[PDB]
C-alpha cells in the first residue's frame, strides 16, 4: 500500500489537507480501500485510519 500510495501523489497530497476536518480524509480513504477488500486485513485499515 505504500507503493500504492506514494507514486500516486495527487491523491496522496489529498490525504494531506489538515485544514479539512480529519474524518474527511479517512472518509475518502475507506472509500478507496474497500473499493475492493483484497486488502484482506482490517487491522491495516485501523492503523492507517
Amino acid at each position: 500500500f505504500s507503493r500504492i500510495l506514494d507514486v500516486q501523489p495527487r491523491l496522496a497530497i489529498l490525504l494531506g489537507d489538515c485544514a479539512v476536518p480529519a474524518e474527511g480524509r479517512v472518509r475518502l480513504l475507506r472509500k478507496v480501500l474497500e473499493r475492493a477488500d483484497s486488502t484482506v486485513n482490517p487491522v491495516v485499515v485501523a492503523l492507517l485510519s
Binding site: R3, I4, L14, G24, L28, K31, V32, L33, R35, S38
Partner: protein
C-alpha cells in the same frame, strides 16, 4: 497482488461534494497591526 483499480471518481465524490462568505477571525491585534486567521481567498 494489488488494488490496481484506480477508480478516480472515488476521489471526485470526496472533493467535489464540497457559500456564505470568508470571514477572518482576528487572532491578535495591537499598535495598528492585526493578524487575521481564515479568509482563504484574500
Amino acid at each position: 497482488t494489488i488494488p490496481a483499480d484506480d477508480i478516480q471518481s472515488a476521489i471526485e465524490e470526496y472533493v467535489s461534494s464540497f457559500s456564505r462568505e470568508e470571514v477572518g477571525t482576528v487572532v491578535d491585534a495591537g499598535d495598528g497591526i492585526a493578524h487575521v486567521e481564515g479568509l482563504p481567498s484574500v
